[PDB]
Amino acid sequence: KMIEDVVLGEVELIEDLGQYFIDIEGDYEYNVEFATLSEVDYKVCALYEVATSKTYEVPYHDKLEKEDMKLFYDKWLEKDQQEETYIESVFFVNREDAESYIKDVLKGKESLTEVAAEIGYFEL
Secondary structure, three states: OOOOOOOOOOEEEEEEEEEEEEEEEOOOOEEEEEEEEEEEEEOOOEEEEEEEEEEEEEOOOOOOOHHHHHHHHHHHHHHHHHOOOEEEEEEEOOHHHHHHHHHHHOOOEOOHHHHHHHHOOOOO
């Protein structure tokens, strides 16, 4: 298996490299599963973190339409900032492996619109 045990160091800096959306559920209130890619600088080396989270009961209270997705994004972020949504992390020595993990294992997309389209809220 490809996963090993590591004991991490003292974090100097964390840089968010992007958010990737994995799933959208619901028809009135929405759940949004997502992953965050970060570069974590320790005293002596850096690792890439892929952190999976899930936000529940985003009170968007409207049918999803492609032209409205910034509205949906804002509502999601507003809900996500209110409560603890972190689930788990996998760390990577190199960034290409972390992005491959997001893309082909988690099936994360770079936007909510892409996920909503593949689920079937609308076509793209």
